């Protein structure tokens, strides 16, 4: 589990409309900033900072840590990218599960 969905559900006070909103916002931020996670893109540092906060906002605590370590020179941008992949994997799957639940 990359994402602590209990954290996000608490942020939402258990309301799935708010969970759905926040997940969609995170995916939007990821789409904006992830292309900058490349040492040859001058956005990279701002991207790591922004991802770090978005991550901690939604319960992707491991991603947040990886970003903090990258800022400390202890992790690569590749490590941030693969942590971001795991958080997106989780988030997309949670959204899918909600849809499946509504169906069955």
TrEMBL record:
Q: Which residues form the HPt domain?
A: 45-86
Sorted keywords for this record are: Transferase, Two-component regulatory system
Q: Name one GO biological process term.
A: phosphorelay signal transduction system
Q: State if NAD is listed as a keyword.
A: no
Lipid metabolism in keyword set: no
Question: InterPro entries, per this entry?
Answer: HPT_dom_sf, Sig_transdc_His_kin_Hpt_dom
As one GO molecular function, the record gives:
protein kinase activity
Coiled coil regions in record:
none
Descriptive protein name: Histidine phosphotransferase
What is the organism of origin for this protein? Caulobacter vibrioides (strain ATCC 19089 / CIP 103742 / CB 15) (Caulobacter crescentus)
Q: Gene encoding this polypeptide?
A: shpA
């Amino acid at each position: 589990g990359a994402v602590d969905f209990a954290y996000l559900e608490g942020f939402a006070a258990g309301d799935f409309a708010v969970v759905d909103e926040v997940l969609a916002l995170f995916r939007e931020q990821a789409a904006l900033w992830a292309p900058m996670l490349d040492p040859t893109h001058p956005g990279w540092k701002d991207a790591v900072h922004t991802v770090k906060g978005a991550a901690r906002g939604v319960g992707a605590f491991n991603l947040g840590e990886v970003c903090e370590r990258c800022e400390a020179g202890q992790e690569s941008l590749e490590g941030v990218r693969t942590a971001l992949d795991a958080a997106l994997l989780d988030i997309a799957a949670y959204a899918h599960e909600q849809a499946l639940r509504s169906l069955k």
